[model samples]
Target: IHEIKQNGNRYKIEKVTDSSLKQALASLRQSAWNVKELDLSGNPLSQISAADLAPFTKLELLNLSSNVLYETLDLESLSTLRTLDLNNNYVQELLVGPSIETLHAANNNISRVSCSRGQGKKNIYLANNKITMLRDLDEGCRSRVQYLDLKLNEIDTVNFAELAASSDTLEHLNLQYNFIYDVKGQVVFAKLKTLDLSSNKLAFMGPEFQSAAGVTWISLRNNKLVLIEKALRFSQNLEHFDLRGNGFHCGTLRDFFSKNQRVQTVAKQTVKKLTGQNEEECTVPTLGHYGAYCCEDLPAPFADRLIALGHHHHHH
Candidate 1:
């Protein structure tokens, strides 16, 4: 209910306790022709129906987070809007607008994301949502997206081929804390540099990831992995590997860490467990399961050390 005018086009409002914001928007429609930003973050508005704030066609940024909106509010009228924040709302559907560049829809109840007709380079944040499926990314606008966050969701499977077929310029992808079990067609993320796939049910790193040479940082902590050979064979360009809270076999862990140390580009770190069990007891086969095994003979002194250390050896 508190309002103050700053200039002919820019004004500030506070404590707007209205059930609907249409009237205030109507009042500003006449004088605020150059208003580029509008913030209604802490307002008491319960619902944001379709085209209510469409009168502010010149607005480039809209802040509607921390509201009580439950429906898919139509924001198509704000064709010039670039940044939109709808976080902490009750929205279950996320409809990407055409001109939106930075969208913050985190802490919502969204289940699905579809951008079939949007056009613009967007940085989308849908973390803390209930999203289980990812579709409609093949739309033209996907090529322009640079950063995507789908963390803290219920996603179990991802179609890497489909994701790669849609977006080509994606640089950062955060898929942590999901239910992803398998990753097929990893070559689609060839341009990705930062990837977070922690806290999933992934059992193996598939052959499709062999072409992801640009990825530098990868987090696979808290997964169902029992071996690291498959992951090492695929992620050759990796710089940091976080394998905390995994089911890794100790001997394989030591072997992989030694090999990665020689590579000079891969850095490995493990988490501390209360039991203090530092050694892995499982044996890894030298061939077949990971496509090709080229290590026919072990290096002389190191082979002797490995043999003396009672490590299992396999020849290919």
Candidate 2:
């Protein structure tokens, strides 16, 4: 730790089985505290109270991951701190500066985060937490986030307008493994590319969806969608869509037999939306039956109805 005083600005004390950070900080000289980067990951820390770290105000990157910390940090004093990692801890909120560009706090108990930087290219990771609300997240970060991850939480609502403020920069959003049942709010994010809303309790998607004008890939896997047209209203421009594990009816199979070629066209898109990806595109065995379920592979009951309907139409 004394090397921080002699030269360089990077210090690493990660992966210590046991130690008192209090003692470590007591040994750090004022010069050592000026180091811009510090790593204390994989320790058995109990807390990061202010007194022990108040003097180190020149930090730019700080890593406190893989610890057993539960107390809130005194980061407001670290005016120069930009990048912070508190993975696998008990933190409940994020407090950062105006120039933060990269921040990750995965596997914590965070329920809130506030990054006020309003430029661009900010990457945030808040996965594996217990966040159940979106009202606060919208308040901060009115703009300037490129990639935001909110996976493995308890979010049940979406506020797209809040995201649209940074739409020009915001690109990827991951909302997998949540309790989302509704999507709405003021719209329009022309730059959004990837979205994941898999493993939710959505019975339908529509009417209130924020328009993602440039989306390319989306995942609604393990949802409760039963309508094709309604879901397509929100995802018209996506090149890749995954809706496998959703509850779907076989009525669409009747359209597969329609004399109109456009019916087949819509049928193919519907199947792809339901199963997410085409049969020809899939290589793995994890694919569901819907994408590969062709006209010849329709259910017997639906197939019988289509055959009978065709015969009647021919006779007429």
Candidate 3:
């Protein structure tokens, strides 16, 4: 009773009773072993012996996601494997092959990952996992890794200096939705473009922002920011900056505009979206509420006095 589907050189054999890799292969005919891409995902597959997967010499892309896999997966024998999808599983660790370039291992219990030190690696998607700290890559040769998405994790701190050593080729780094409070380190990524640290508890960051010479886009929205000028002093080449949903003191904001009129002009053009999108409003503590003036709505009498302080209300 063989239950396998084939399309071209690709094959999908899923949801079998026998969890062993050898048992699943035995159900398929000999011709199916020549598959280039295989999707054994959404099965009860738990055990994966290296000898059982050794027959597919031409295998390049393998998807073993959504299984009861809890043990460490060792796929170093699959030399031709390029892309691996291990999403929605209980995999605690992974040891992939040298030729693997793209790895999708999101939504797992993965706390450790040890892949080959080969330069063929590019993208690693490890979002929604239990990785706490960023350390040296297991094999220590990840100089060419480009995009590393570590969103929705338990990371509280980040050492850019340490990360720069392993991946100089890092471009887009998504560390949003973490517990980062303060940032104080040198950003040495020469090719880093967009950095998303939104939805974090970032309070203050100064010279650390000065080092990223190649950074163009940044998002620090929804944080505990009071004085933003120091945080953005070195980010001169920004194309789009999102500073909304932050606890900014009226005085600090006034100073920010007074120091940089160019940014003031840009801020005025940008509308605040608190609860209303089309119609926005700015709330005043004692004087009551007023229309969204984007800082130009400071009441005549209360303007100067209020500028001396702020953060209770977040109108827009």
Candidate 4:
């Protein structure tokens, strides 16, 4: 049960039941030499060999998603290939060729990956994998990648050395749902726009934003952050910020909101929710479940001084 279609230079064979990759290619006959795009998805391919794909010298785009592939996917022989899709497979290691511009290999068992050492390569998607360390991402100086997705992995730290080559070109990065607890190095993203680091384990961000000065939008929704001063000192250009789902200390929360009134336009609504409120009662949105603790921890004299300053700034 196979469906083969030949629309000009593109050849597609979908849902090849009771068949292998070699059998599927064998059914293609002499037309494989001229096709520029090939799709062989939803098959039972366990492996691919150079001999099985040598006929397609003109191939550029290849889709082999939703297959039974395992271990390595060597496509170095497809010298003209530019775009590739190997998603929903069992591949353990991914190595892209130098000519590939875009790669989609998400939802695999990949713990290691290396991009091509060529120009014009833009995107790489390796989400939902088992990667635990930063290894070989900048190998071969794969410096042209713009968008990289590494969400839902086991990455424990952000090592700037592993991302040195692509720092200039990396615009968007998604590291959400990882195990990142710390940022280990310093590298600036000159073009970084959106970064999603939600649902991680970052408790104290030490000089991490020193390099993210050009970032526009960032999300730290579910981390372990309690302080926000040093982490945001250099983010003067940050346009959007998300700090919800965190248990911020009431003192730091109040102090940050009070001291950084000009920082209001950055996280405008969040700042409005935490600052500019009457302090007669302790009901100003809990610095996240700790609003009463803020009042309880205050000595009577400190409360009196704040009440005094409240009128001085409350003058006009």
> TM-scores of all models?
0.75, 0.73, 0.77, 0.79
Each model's lDDT: 0.62, 0.63, 0.66, 0.70
List the pairs of residues colliding in candidate 1.
250-280
When sorted by lDDT, best at the front, the candidate numbers are 4, 3, 2, 1
lDDT string for model 4 (1-316, tens) is: 6678888989998767544555778877578777799888888877776567778888889898998889987776667788889999999877766778888989989877766577774688889988887673547434766888989999888876577788889888889999887665678888889889889987654566556667777777677665455344535667666665554455555665564454444555443445543221223544233321222234345544543443354321
lDDT tens digits, residues 80-126, model 2? 67788888888876666665778888998887676654454678888
lDDT of 1 by residue, 1-316 (tens): 6563455454555566554356677767766677778777866566764367666767788788887777565565566778889889888776655777888989988875555355556688889988885652334335466788989988877766555543466778788999987666655564688778899876554455554546777777677655445355535566665555454444445565565553322331221132233322223444211111112233345433433343234421
The CA lDDT at 43 in model 1 is 65
- The residue pairs in collision within model 3 are none
Candidate 3: which stretches are off by over 4 Å?
A: 27-29, 136-142, 166-168, 211-213, 228-237, 249-316
Judge candidate 3 against the unseen true structure and give its global Cα lDDT, from 0 to 1.
0.66
Give, for candidate 3, the lowest lDDT window spanning 10 residues.
287-296
| Candidate number that wins on lDDT, 1 or 2 | 2
Tens digit of per-residue lDDT, candidate 3, span 1-316: 3368889888988657453456667655386457899888888877575567778888889898887777788887788889999999888877888887898999988788877767654688889888776662454324467788888887767767656644468788788888776566675777778788888776554457655545676677666554444344424555545555554545556655565565544443333323444223434443221122222334344543433333235422
For this target, which candidate reaches the highest TM-score against the unseen true structure? Answer: 4
RMSD to the true structure for each prediction, in A, is 9.0, 9.3, 6.6, 9.1
Worst window of 10 by summed lDDT in candidate 1? 287-296
- Judging by lDDT, tell me the better candidate of 1 and 4: 4
